[PDB]
Amino acid sequence: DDFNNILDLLINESKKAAQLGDIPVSCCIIDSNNNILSLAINSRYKNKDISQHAEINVINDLISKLNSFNLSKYKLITTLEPCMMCYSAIKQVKINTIYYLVDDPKYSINDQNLNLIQIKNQKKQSEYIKLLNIFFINARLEHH
């Protein structure tokens, strides 16, 4: 569909990540009934851990809850197209679908049982783009 309520929630969460120095990305994992089982934000720089993107964080939350590395029954929704580290972690726990809102400007993948699917929600996409733009502006100001 367009996940308007889940996206409202994720966009609200990611603000937290932006306040603390990380690209404001939030994401959740859902079961087939679209219930959220785990939610996480990006905390790579905040916790000085190369792996702590929102996607790997949410994967680890669910591994913890279910005591299992097999998430084949679940789908992932993120505000921003995942990097390749996260894409590979998502693949390695057998999640078959990644919904993302905003693709990443910054590989050639012929994987399957793994679809990367852009959510169409223009209002939410424009809102999240404005949040990211504010983050990057502050990024270049501190860069200089």
Q: Which is nearer to a second copy, 6 or 11 (CB)?
A: 6
> Any contact of residue 1 with a second copy (CB under 8 A)?
yes
Residue type at 142?
A: E
Query: By C-alpha distance, which of 21, 98, 19 is closest to 58?
Result: 98
Q: Is 27 annotated as a binding residue?
A: no
Q: Which run of H or E residues covers position 20?
A: none
Site string for Cl ion, 80-99 (x = CB under 5 A): --------x-----------
Question: If DSSP codes are grouped into helix, strand and coil, which group holds residue 79?
Answer: strand
Q: Which does 67 bind (CB under 5 to 8 A by kind): Zn ion, Cl ion, a second copy, none?
A: none
Identified binder of a second copy from the candidate list 69, 88, 111, 138, rule CB under 8 A:
111
